[PDB]
Amino acid sequence: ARSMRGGIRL
Amino acid sequence: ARSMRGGIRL
Amino acid sequence: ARSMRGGIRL
Amino acid sequence: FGRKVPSNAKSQHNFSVIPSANIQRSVFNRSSGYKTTFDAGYLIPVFLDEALPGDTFHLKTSVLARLSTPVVPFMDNLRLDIQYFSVPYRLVWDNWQKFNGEQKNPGDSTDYLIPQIKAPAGGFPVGSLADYFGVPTGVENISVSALPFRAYNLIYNEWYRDENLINSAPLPLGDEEETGLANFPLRKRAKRHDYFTSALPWP
Amino acid sequence: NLIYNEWYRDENLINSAPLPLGDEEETGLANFPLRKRAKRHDYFTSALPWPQKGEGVEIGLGVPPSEGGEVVDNLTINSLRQAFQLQRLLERDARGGTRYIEIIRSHFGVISPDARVQ
Amino acid sequence: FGRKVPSNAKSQHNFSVIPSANIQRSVFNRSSGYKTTFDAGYLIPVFLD
Amino acid sequence: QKGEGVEIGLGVPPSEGGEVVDNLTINSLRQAFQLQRLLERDARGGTRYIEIIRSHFGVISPDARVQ
Amino acid sequence: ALNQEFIEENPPMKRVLAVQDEPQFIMDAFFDLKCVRPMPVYSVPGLIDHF
Amino acid sequence: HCFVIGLVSVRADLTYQQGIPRMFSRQTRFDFYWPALAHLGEQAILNKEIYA
Amino acid sequence: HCFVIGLVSVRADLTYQQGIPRMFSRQTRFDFYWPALAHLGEQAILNKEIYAQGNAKDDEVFGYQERYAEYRYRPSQITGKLRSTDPQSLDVWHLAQRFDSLP
Numbered sequence: 095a096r097s098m099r100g101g102i103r104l
Numbered sequence: 105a106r107s108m109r110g111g112i113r114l
Numbered sequence: 115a116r117s118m119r120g121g122i123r124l
Numbered sequence: 125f126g127r128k129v130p131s132n133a134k135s136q137h138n139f140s141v142i143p144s145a146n147i148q149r150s151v152f153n154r155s156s157g158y159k160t161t162f163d164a165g166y167l168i169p170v171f172l173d174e175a176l177p178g179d180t181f182h183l184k185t186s187v188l189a190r191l192s193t194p195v196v197p198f199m200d201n202l203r204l205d206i207q208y209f210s211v212p213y214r215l216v217w218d219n220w221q222k223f224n225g226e227q228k229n230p231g232d233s234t235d236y237l238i239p240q241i242k243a244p245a246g247g248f249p250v251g252s253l254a255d256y257f258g259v260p261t262g263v264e265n266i267s268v269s270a271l272p273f274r275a276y277n278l279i280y281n282e283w284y285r286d287e288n289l290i291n292s293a294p295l296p297l298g299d300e301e302e303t304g305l306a307n308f309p310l311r312k313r314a315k316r317h318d319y320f321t322s323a324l325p326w327p
Numbered sequence: 328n329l330i331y332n333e334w335y336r337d338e339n340l341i342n343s344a345p346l347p348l349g350d351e352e353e354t355g356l357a358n359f360p361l362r363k364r365a366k367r368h369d370y371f372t373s374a375l376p377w378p379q380k381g382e383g384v385e386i387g388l389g390v391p392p393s394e395g396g397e398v399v400d401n402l403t404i405n406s407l408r409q410a411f412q413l414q415r416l417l418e419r420d421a422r423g424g425t426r427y428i429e430i431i432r433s434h435f436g437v438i439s440p441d442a443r444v445q
Numbered sequence: 446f447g448r449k450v451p452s453n454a455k456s457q458h459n460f461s462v463i464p465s466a467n468i469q470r471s472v473f474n475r476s477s478g479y480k481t482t483f484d485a486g487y488l489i490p491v492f493l494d
Numbered sequence: 495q496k497g498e499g500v501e502i503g504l505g506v507p508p509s510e511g512g513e514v515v516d517n518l519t520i521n522s523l524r525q526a527f528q529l530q531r532l533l534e535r536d537a538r539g540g541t542r543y544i545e546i547i548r549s550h551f552g553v554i555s556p557d558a559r560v561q
Numbered sequence: 562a563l564n565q566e567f568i569e570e571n572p573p574m575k576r577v578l579a580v581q582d583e584p585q586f587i588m589d590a591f592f593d594l595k596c597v598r599p600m601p602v603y604s605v606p607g608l609i610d611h612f
Numbered sequence: 613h614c615f616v617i618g619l620v621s622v623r624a625d626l627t628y629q630q631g632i633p634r635m636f637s638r639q640t641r642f643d644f645y646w647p648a649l650a651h652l653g654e655q656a657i658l659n660k661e662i663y664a
Numbered sequence: 665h666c667f668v669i670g671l672v673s674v675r676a677d678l679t680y681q682q683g684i685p686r687m688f689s690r691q692t693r694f695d696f697y698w699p700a701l702a703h704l705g706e707q708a709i710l711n712k713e714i715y716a717q718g719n720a721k722d723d724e725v726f727g728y729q730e731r732y733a734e735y736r737y738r739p740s741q742i743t744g745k746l747r748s749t750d751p752q753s754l755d756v757w758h759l760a761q762r763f764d765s766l767p
């Protein structure tokens with residue numbers, strides 16, 4: 095639910 | 105400052 | 115009145 | 125029957141969360157003076173600035189305007205006014221996101237350049253938008269970014285243009301270099317709403 | 328397709344699903360296949376194609392002639408620190424993502440609403 | 446010296462303000478069922494409105 | 495910066511008549527960085543002896559004792 | 562006619578003003594911004610690994 | 613990222629010196645106000661009201 | 665034993681009427697502010713920022729100033745018929761310097 099590595103993908 | 109006739113123009 | 119850049123000149 | 129064991133999927137997800145950036149914000153005064161001459165009915169861009177993501181601005185404006193000398197104390201009221209607008213760069217240039225490194229497909233070029241207006245023959249003239257934004261007039265070969273000029277036309281189309289009497293000011297969103305301000309004239313404001321000026325072409 | 332491109336597509340492994348915005352009539356679903364979701368983030372699936380988003384910053388050295396060499400100037404410390412900060416920028420882009428909302432959230436403290444960035 | 450008289454510009458502006466639309470909102474239940482078969486890994490659009 | 499600017503040497507190929515430069519030690523490289531910081535502090539801070547003291551150290555010297 | 566030329570603001574300033582052929586308004590304006598910005602108030606060169 | 617743009621303008625108040633006030637132009641019973649008439653469609657401003 | 669000397673001077677405030685505000689001159693991603701860039705070395709003020717001409721001289725260095733200084737500083741401006749370059753100038757109204765050649 096936070097800022098993931100590699101940009102957002104759900 | 106309300107909804108004018110003829111649409112918005114300032 | 116503080117320490118200016120480029121040294122002091124009044 | 126037995127009870128199922130957990131999966132590690134949540135701890136693996138947590139190891140992939142990047143830390144937040146530490147930004148080093150600060151507060152300071154960005155005061156500026158601006159001096160000019162203008163005529164009634166035009167929209168004059170007297171203030172222009174660039175805001176970053178996560179800026180906060182509080183603005184106080186002081187004005188002194190002097191009317192050049194009247195013949196008599198003429199009886200009609202005459203307002204001076206100032207209106208401020210925010211214009212995101214993505215509204216005035218379609219490649220703004222891709223300039224900042226967005227890619228439509230993996231390995232796309234990015235590497236765009238800010239769209240330009242070249243000065244026309246003789247340089248930009250007095251009383252043009254280039255003059256009022258403070259680009260030096262009368263200089264032959266210079267160029268400036270188009271995005272401030274596109275931002276003026278976009279404000280005009282959305283807030284000052286009469287939706288049914290007046291055609292949209294041209295708003296090119298692409299990369300193409302302009303020459304001269306033929307797409308960017310200084311615009312007139314509309315008259316106050318009254319019996320005639322709030323009339324419509326049709327029922 | 329617009330939901331897929333913005334929320335499910337991996338920004339660096341997968342090409343954008345086609346999103347025609349005009350009036351044109353389509354025939355068949357060739358632009359509209361049923362899409363697969365990505366696997367959970369783990370050691371392998373959160374890996375990246377490269378150590379940074381760009382080419383990688385290389386400080387030039389030149390090469391001897393055969394004639395036909397490459398001449399490079401002496402390194403200023405200002406050139407060298409600019410190369411380091413450029414590499415930090417491209418690493419932040421790889422790690423953080425490169426959609427305009429990901430740039431804003433990674434390079435600045437700012438949580439933009441999705442609605443105002445289309 | 447004399448004092449200036451007002452202009453009518455504000456009353457003329459006020460006559461040009463259109464009234465707000467009266468909307469007739471209401472609350473109701475829009476329940477719906479949906480039944481399907483699918484396979485893992487696909488994004489299936491099960492709800493649309 | 496106040497000085498020439500710190501340039502880490504690279505040498506140049508011969509035509510004979512080249513320039514030979516040794517391998518860079520990390521100690522040489524960090525010394526080049528700290529020298530550049532010193533010359534930038536001199537540019538920014540000033541170079542009268544009182545400006546040096548006030549910029550390189552925490553010290554407010556009286557004017558009278560420095561002539 | 563009800564058109565662009567009619568609704569654009571165009572007061573007859575040229576007749577109420579004593580001096581001909583000079584701009585109607587001379588203006589001095591001053592903009593006092595208090596900014597909070599994502600940058601330091603002065604930047605000293607340095608800090609290579611950092612930020 | 614945004615530009616902020618501040619636009620100055622000057623506007624005069626409106627007043628007229630040509631054409632006929634519409635009260636001199638009434639000629640038939642339904643040119644006067646009647647309550648049963650108040651929600652008819654838009655009326656024409658005639659050119660003589662601004663420039664006779 | 666000392667002299668005491670009192671020195672009078674008069675100074676006007678500074679405002680500019682020639683050259684391009686640096687916000688029109690940005691052209692590439694790293695000409696904009698980025699937090700990872702804020703502690704780079706001094707940047708060049710280009711001659712066009714104080715006296716534009718369209719000559720190759722315009723892109724040569726006037727002097728050096730702190731990185732992203734133009735986000736912190738905002739030089740005051742003369743824009744209209746007030747400019748000393750206007751053929752019918754109103755520059756009697758202000759004390760902005762007129763450069764007749766490149767400073």
